[PDB]
Amino acid sequence: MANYTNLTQGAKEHEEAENIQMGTFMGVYLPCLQNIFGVILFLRLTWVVGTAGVLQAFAIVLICCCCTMLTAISMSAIATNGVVPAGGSYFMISRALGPEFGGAVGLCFYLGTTFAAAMYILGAIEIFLVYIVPSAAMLNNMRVYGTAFLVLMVLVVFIGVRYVNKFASLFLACVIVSILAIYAGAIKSSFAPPHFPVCMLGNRTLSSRHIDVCSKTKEINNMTVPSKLWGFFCNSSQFFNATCDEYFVHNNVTSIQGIPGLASGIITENLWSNYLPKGEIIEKPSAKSSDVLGSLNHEYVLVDITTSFTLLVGIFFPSVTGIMAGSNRSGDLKDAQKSIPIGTILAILTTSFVYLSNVVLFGACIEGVVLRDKFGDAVKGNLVVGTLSWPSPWVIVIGSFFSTCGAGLQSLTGAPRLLQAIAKDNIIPFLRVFGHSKANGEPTWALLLTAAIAELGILIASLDLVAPILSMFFLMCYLFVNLACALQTLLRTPNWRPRFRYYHWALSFMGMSICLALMFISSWYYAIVAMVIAGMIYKYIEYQGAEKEWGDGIRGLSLSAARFALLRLEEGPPHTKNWRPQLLVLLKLDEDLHVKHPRLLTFASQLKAGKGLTIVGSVIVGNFLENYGEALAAEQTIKHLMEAEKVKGFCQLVVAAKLREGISHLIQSCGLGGMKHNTVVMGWPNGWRQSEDARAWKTFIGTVRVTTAAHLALLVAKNISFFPSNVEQFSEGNIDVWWIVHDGGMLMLLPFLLKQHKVWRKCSIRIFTVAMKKDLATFLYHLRIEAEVEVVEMHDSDISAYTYERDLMMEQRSNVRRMHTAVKLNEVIVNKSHEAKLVLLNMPGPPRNPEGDENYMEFLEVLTEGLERVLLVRGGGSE
Amino acid sequence: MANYTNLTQGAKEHEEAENIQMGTFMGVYLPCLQNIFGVILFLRLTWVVGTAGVLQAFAIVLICCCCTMLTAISMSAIATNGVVPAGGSYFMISRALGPEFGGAVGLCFYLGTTFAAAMYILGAIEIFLVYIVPSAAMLNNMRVYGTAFLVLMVLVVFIGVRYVNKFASLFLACVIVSILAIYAGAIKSSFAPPHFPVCMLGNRTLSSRHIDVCSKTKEINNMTVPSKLWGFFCNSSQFFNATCDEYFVHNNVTSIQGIPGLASGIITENLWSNYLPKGEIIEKPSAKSSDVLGSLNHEYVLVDITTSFTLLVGIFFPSVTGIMAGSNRSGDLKDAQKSIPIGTILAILTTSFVYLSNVVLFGACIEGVVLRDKFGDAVKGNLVVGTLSWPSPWVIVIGSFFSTCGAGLQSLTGAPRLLQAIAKDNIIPFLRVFGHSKANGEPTWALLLTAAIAELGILIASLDLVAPILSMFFLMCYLFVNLACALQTLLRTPNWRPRFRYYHWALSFMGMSICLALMFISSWYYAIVAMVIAGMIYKYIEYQGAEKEWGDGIRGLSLSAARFALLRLEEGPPHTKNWRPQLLVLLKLDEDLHVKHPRLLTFASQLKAGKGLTIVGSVIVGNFLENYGEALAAEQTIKHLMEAEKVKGFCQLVVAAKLREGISHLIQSCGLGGMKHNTVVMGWPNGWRQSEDARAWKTFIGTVRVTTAAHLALLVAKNISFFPSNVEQFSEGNIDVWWIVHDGGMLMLLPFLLKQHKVWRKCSIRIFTVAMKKDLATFLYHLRIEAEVEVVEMHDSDISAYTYERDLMMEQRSNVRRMHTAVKLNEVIVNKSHEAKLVLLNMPGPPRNPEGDENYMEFLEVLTEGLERVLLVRGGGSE
Ligand SMILES: *[C@@H]1O[C@H](CO)[C@@H](O[C@@H]2O[C@H](CO)[C@@H](O[C@@H]3O[C@H](CO)[C@@H](O)[C@H](O)[C@@H]3O)[C@H](O)[C@H]2NC(C)=O)[C@H](O)[C@H]1NC(C)=O
Ligand SMILES: *[C@@H]1O[C@H](CO)[C@@H](O[C@@H]2O[C@H](CO)[C@@H](O[C@@H]3O[C@H](CO)[C@@H](O)[C@H](O)[C@@H]3O)[C@H](O)[C@H]2NC(C)=O)[C@H](O)[C@H]1NC(C)=O
Ligand SMILES: *[C@@H]1O[C@H](CO)[C@@H](O)[C@H](O)[C@H]1NC(C)=O
Ligand SMILES: *[C@@H]1O[C@H](CO)[C@@H](O)[C@H](O)[C@H]1NC(C)=O
């Protein structure tokens, strides 16, 4: 009907989509099903079940499948987010997680896939040599034939990948036919089990490669000649004065049915772990037994490796890997974000069900002794899982070989394409050599490097030792795929819109934890090494991207960190639950281009206590075309002054023609979007009456109006020459805060920040509210600093200039009276707080008409007449 | 002569210095020495030597001393940088590494100190019970006696810490007297070793708590009666047909000298590991032996714990811990930055030399069987190391007890002070409860919590099991102390001036790696838990600091990240090794407040390709007091447009009185210090001749002058309405870069940034140099980008207006002819490149006199007459 492929899509298809079909079943389901079902299912699942007991084997398969299922959910969350690139899964992961995580996952998954092509070559060799056509001799035969087979497969992939594309379907056919034959044998074996017997001497297990009859004697022509096994246990071979060993004269050889019915119920026997160390004779705890020992013969089938749980999880994990292959055909899809998630999750559920079913079936169908036989012995040298099959074990012996060769081809085509895809992205420099492609878009040097690493793997010619390394690399890939999603969801990374029905970051975090535990339990030895390798590749990719875009290595790294923080800061709720003053100190520069008020900087330092944001801005009057040198010089001056007063922050000079216009630009333009200020700190215009130009107060009131309009808070410090330095202290004093009807946020917050500095540490706080005891106490209760309160009420007209404003606020959603009431306020404040070290004091808004600006300044001067040090405060905003 | 103490200085002594003597020996040396010499030296060092073999014991002691020495170097680097606060080591660590690392190290060191108070109480109890005043019965005796002793010590430190301060000198005296007695015994054991014999049955060692003579029969009144050991190996006790077991009738009991001479040469025997598992009889591979077996008796000295290498390193590590106690008496110092590093490093060298010498002395003076005896058995119940002393083992057994109870007092004074110091800092909120102090400043709740944790430790009543947890916590403390230093030195963290003669960041990195390996080798399953607890405390402290200073949790967290990156960015070389265009796109806003040139944003996105910094700036002509609504509206519009054109960056609007002045402020004030732009991208003023207002081109040339004076690059795009979009592409085309005489760097770097985008991907590049050939080829080969070259030389007059300015540059570091030559340049440029897709072109500077601005604009206009899409480029800077 239709011809399809299971391979990956490298740069060949991505460059095609960059220059400018199949559904869910044939597109993202069958490739994943063909790539999860590996050699393990046929060569090591039985041994794992036997060695672990059905309970712990079920636990193993469940833990592995849960790691891989949470990784599938994270990978589907990656697939749905944004447009899915036409390339393989690597391109999806890159465009979804940034080039850093993309390169880390790419290299770890690549080493995984290479060592998988090695494991599959070892498995095909083991099947060909042990079962198809018959210690260290076996290992060296495997080394030699595996190297020959790898050279052949490398040539196959290099010359004729089109034929791999054509016969991927035949490979999947073989896989599914083998699995269905396993199930048909398992079901048939219930009523009619096959006649595969096993010789067993007492409770010690015998081999069957050389023995023919499970009897201590055979009778040819009614002659009690002793069986061949007598020769394999007694150095007499004739029974004539047979000097037989200890355990042989006592016990009984029995031909136990090796495949009992699924209804026979052997599961009660093998429901428990064995974990016997290396070289122990395999015992069935059912048959009779003597107690003498010693006769360690050559025919006793032995445990071939010191097995443990932590070892079994590693040996079995490479049978569930392959879910990144689910999306290796993502370019040829109709609805990517719909086909990929459902396809991957359904394929993983299918394979998990197949494994969890075969575990229990093997528990109930194969004898508890033939399971622990890791090389298909004791059954006349037949595949143990093969004994469960309807036609013959040869269908499995052939299907497994063809499937393992097909998976080797798939992973020897998927590894170099992935490596050249990582190379052409210029993510990592040194891999550029591997970008070299063939004419039709096929890798040349990547294939050679893949072959070299696969050979390095094959040098360890044992599946039982190649599986842990493969599992560790794939576990690192899955751990990063889960962690990147969890991180980008928590921190609210920009362009992280996971349009998935079931993805929650708790799933990805639980997956990261599960698979990290798997890594470390399997082998912390390899786990630390893999984590460090992946971390180094990650940091190196980040450094290279920095040096590529910003131009410097470490400079650009910090630059990128700052840019990313500010960007993340933009796509958020611009309001904050608490109000904190981020100061903009408007320093006044004299004609000497020297700060006319260092006390402004000292007080800003005292207010922020060296933490937070402090932008010190200043305007130089003149033309920028002919002042840039003076601008840089004054900037160095202000930076030295800031560093001298321990102010941590930045400086900005604007050369403008009009000081008023310069300030009106500074107030509204300082800071990058997100890092805006919300308070403007000014110095009082001393000697405003003594200036015949009157431009002092005009500029001051213009700045006040601009700050009020911009909705920023305002702190005008008056008599700033008396504000203390850093080195001196106050022995004792009182900050008297006069919190009028309005702006309780600032008037209550500032003295708390100020008393928190060492200079103002030894002073007390006195709130002389003029605008109730419990409500004010709550704020003090939260600030956790005792602050004596007191109320001094006066007439409304006395507070007219305030309450008028209040009315204007309410509706929003005479001069002689204002002056003589400012003098009444003066009388109270001076009589109560003359000796205060710092008097905070609320401000009225400037008049709506610009004519009363002189009157406004006279009002302020009166309101502050006689006080040693005043901090005029105005809220202005929301808070 | 003088009285001192070795305890810590908490917040009580720091608030004194905030409100407002000893040298090196008595100030930093003796406290560190008295705190490193713990109980291990006396109770488990001999056992470790025995069960490890002198070689591996030396390796273990060397690794521990190596980690502690590298951590001492990092801590000295912390101590020298800046002023040393008057508080304990915690205040130094905090002020040097920030509150996050300060709190993490504080809590890890505090858990360390609590479990150290527990280990020292267990050790004092073990010495009292086993050696001074005599399986699970012993464990329960230790539990109950340790709980009683802990409640006593807690009461002592709560009531009467002054007497502990007084007797710290007596405790140190005890330590030194004990160590000198050990050395004097080792020396006297050269000629005349002591008479401590051990009964040994062949090569199997016997106990001696109940035996009297190491003979099978003693003779009272000429009667060869059987010895008591007969009563312990033979259930006859009469010799009248005695039925003795297997091993006893064959072998011989011998009185082997237990302490041979130092020159005896027994070291050759115990120079190898034993690592025997649990319950194994201790075997001396020197004496004769039969081969019979079976006699498992009660008098065989048995290995009391399953020793291993990874267990031994953990059991021994808590004898090198305590280096932070060196600077726990820093407030009472004369020259802190000189006294702390020298004192700490000399103390660690002294203790390391003592340990490395005692390892070899124990190897070569004590029989290889008495060393592996972990409870001083087989020597009539005396301390193993005690047997090596000049007067008697009693001096050592009393000195060790007094030293260990003194160190218990020390750690129950040092742990709660450190906890109240971490509480009063309000670094971690929930610990605020423990901030309460006594009248004289002594912790009350902190002492109770320390008592609770120490009791939890004591409930595991075994030094051998408490030591790994203690060692893991101190290892985590040292790991953070080495990693924060490595990071702050590499990343150029502000205020990180390590004024030390020998501190190089490679040392701290090596220490970090060393004792990361130590953690994991000791117990990876404990170590991951410790790392995760420390990481959670670290991130929670960072979050609380963000919420405190900025006002919000996650928003403020990204804010802190951005501010810290910018600060770190300031104190660096302001130049960059590479130049990369960081664009300021100047969008001109029409009277309708709509973006007059979206193609500006499109081309900016194509130039930066979604990465880098793009500040889109625009000026709104008008008065700010009555326009802020329009400002927010236009800002939202420009932000939506930036998102529409795939531009990632920030938007700044300035409401200015004069458009020219607004742009002159924007060009010099955009961006925070460090994140400054370097290029200004402008749109050409189309229809300047048809708009009879002379201010259009005036404003344009003013912006050009401002850019040139600011030393920023300039990119004027002309005919921008026909520039492409993001969706469309080019089939085939040539980006022709016409590098006129100067400013080649940008003119060549731009077309590669352009062609690296999907739009311009399918175009070619042509460098039409006018004013060698191989010089370009080498630059392009270094950049790994190839293009097509062509050279078109012309007459000098034609480029006169250029060359003039070039000469004015070389000297630094008419108009009608200019127009007739711009027309000649036009001839050639069109004849070669008329049908190009994008013609880059260098620019001449604006005239010096602002009168010829009409002439300059006519020059430009004719130079670009007839070209489809021109990108005028001007260097301006260094590059
Ligand atoms: C296969 O047969 C051998 C030999 O009969 C079994 O070894 C023996 O197993 C029995 C288990 O009942 C052991 O008995 C136990 O002995 C210990 C020590 O004496 C005693 O404390 C227990 O209460 C129990 O009686 C016996 O020692 C052991 N023989 C040895 C170790 O030499 C073997 O267990 C059989 N395999 C299976 C799977 O049952
Ligand atoms: C302390 O004395 C006991 C009692 O003899 C020693 O145990 C025995 O040590 C001999 C050492 O030669 C062991 O012989 C060995 O047998 C193995 C197995 O055939 C062989 O491969 C070796 O070459 C060697 O001949 C013997 O098995 C062992 N008997 C036991 C353990 O029951 C013990 O070794 C002595 N300890 C030391 C430290 O010397
Ligand atoms: C072996 O078989 C014989 C006869 O079938 C039986 O008497 C004997 O008990 C068996 N041996 C054991 C150990 O059960
Ligand atoms: C025990 O000592 C006697 C005499 O001293 C000697 O004959 C005998 O061989 C010794 N036994 C062993 C096992 O060496």
Author numbering:
A (entry chain A), B (entry chain B): 102 to 121, 133 to 246, 260 to 896, 905 to 946, 1028 to 1093
What sentences appear in the manuscript?
Potassium‐coupled chloride transporters (KCCs) play crucial roles in regulating cell volume and intracellular chloride concentration. Decreased inhibitory phosphorylation in response to hypotonic cell swelling stimulates transport activity, and dysfunction of this regulatory process has been associated with various human diseases.
While this structure was obtained under K+‐free conditions, we see the same configuration of the N‐terminus in a lower resolution structure of KCC3b‐PM in presence of K+. Density for N‐terminal helix (purple cartoon) is visible in the cryo‐EM maps of KCC3b‐PM in detergent environments, in both potassium‐free (A) and potassium‐saturated (D) conditions.
